[PDB]
RNA sequence: AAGGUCACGGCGAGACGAGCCGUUUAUCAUUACGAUAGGUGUCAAGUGGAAGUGCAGUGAUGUAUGCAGCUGAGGCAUCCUAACAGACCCACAGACUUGAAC
């Protein structure tokens, strides 16, 4: 008849945790942003926010393969000329660590009004403890043999 | 209500909104806060010798009274004048979840 449409879901969304101590950046960020969208739910619907909060901890110790750790550069460009800001992954992970993952998923998930709204569902922490015991976050399922 | 805004007196603040400081029994008293603008009183400061009268000169003009006289958006003092009257916005405990301690 008519396909079911995500009808109002507010809270009691699952909180997950990922200790990113030596888990390579990309692959992890794909399996983070697949639980950020809700593509693990028969209730999946692109237009509604059926997702689930998650919590990255030890955001200082994400690994990257190859020679990345000195090659990959995050560039923020000021609007004016000459504002380009070369910046290598080692300098960030030293200086402000959570922005690393805060980029990775922010590219993974669908920018727009909705994507922007969801990105809040990622809580990133550089310490080893996370202050959220909200839903008593159950550790996050990883279907990826290579991490 | 706390806080505001307006109004009222103005500024080293300002295109207008902004800002900032006032808003009177504007103390009184044994070492700092309650003079905001004007006026007044005084002092710095400027210009430079007032007016009248006298003297010397036939007359221009000088000379004495005399750092006087006019200045005084700067400094303090002074409630003399004006900050009178007001008015307006502002509220009642800050939905929903689990967690923790007694």
Short mmCIF file of C-alpha atoms in Angstrom, two decimals, chain A residues 18 20 23-34 36-37 54 56 59 62-64 68 72-74 89 92 96-111 115 118-119 122 124:
data_model
loop_
_atom_site.label_atom_id
_atom_site.label_comp_id
_atom_site.label_asym_id
_atom_site.label_seq_id
_atom_site.Cartn_x
_atom_site.Cartn_y
_atom_site.Cartn_z
CA UNK A 18 34.39 4.33 19.98
CA UNK A 20 39.78 5.47 18.56
CA UNK A 23 41.91 2.85 14.51
CA UNK A 24 42.61 4.21 11.08
CA UNK A 25 40.80 7.42 10.39
CA UNK A 26 38.82 6.98 7.19
CA UNK A 27 37.36 3.53 7.75
CA UNK A 28 36.30 4.35 11.28
CA UNK A 29 34.72 7.56 10.08
CA UNK A 30 32.67 5.64 7.54
CA UNK A 31 31.29 3.34 10.17
CA UNK A 32 30.67 6.31 12.45
CA UNK A 33 28.66 8.22 9.85
CA UNK A 34 26.64 5.16 8.94
CA UNK A 36 24.97 8.87 12.34
CA UNK A 37 22.46 8.55 9.48
CA UNK A 54 27.83 8.55 19.32
CA UNK A 56 34.52 9.23 20.13
CA UNK A 59 40.61 11.47 19.90
CA UNK A 62 43.64 8.02 15.76
CA UNK A 63 46.03 6.33 13.37
CA UNK A 64 46.58 7.04 9.69
CA UNK A 68 49.93 10.70 6.05
CA UNK A 72 47.78 15.29 5.00
CA UNK A 73 47.05 18.95 5.48
CA UNK A 74 43.88 20.60 6.65
CA UNK A 89 47.83 16.54 10.39
CA UNK A 92 46.48 19.45 14.49
CA UNK A 96 43.52 20.60 18.62
CA UNK A 97 42.83 16.89 18.25
CA UNK A 98 39.06 16.59 18.04
CA UNK A 99 38.88 18.69 14.88
CA UNK A 100 40.44 15.75 13.02
CA UNK A 101 37.47 13.47 13.39
CA UNK A 102 35.21 16.49 13.30
CA UNK A 103 36.35 16.82 9.68
CA UNK A 104 36.24 13.16 8.79
CA UNK A 105 32.60 12.62 9.56
CA UNK A 106 31.68 16.13 8.49
CA UNK A 107 32.68 15.12 5.00
CA UNK A 108 31.12 11.69 5.22
CA UNK A 109 27.59 12.75 6.07
CA UNK A 110 25.14 14.63 3.86
CA UNK A 111 25.63 18.37 4.06
CA UNK A 115 23.27 17.01 7.59
CA UNK A 118 22.83 15.79 12.63
CA UNK A 119 26.54 16.55 12.90
CA UNK A 122 28.95 13.29 17.17
CA UNK A 124 34.39 14.00 20.30
#
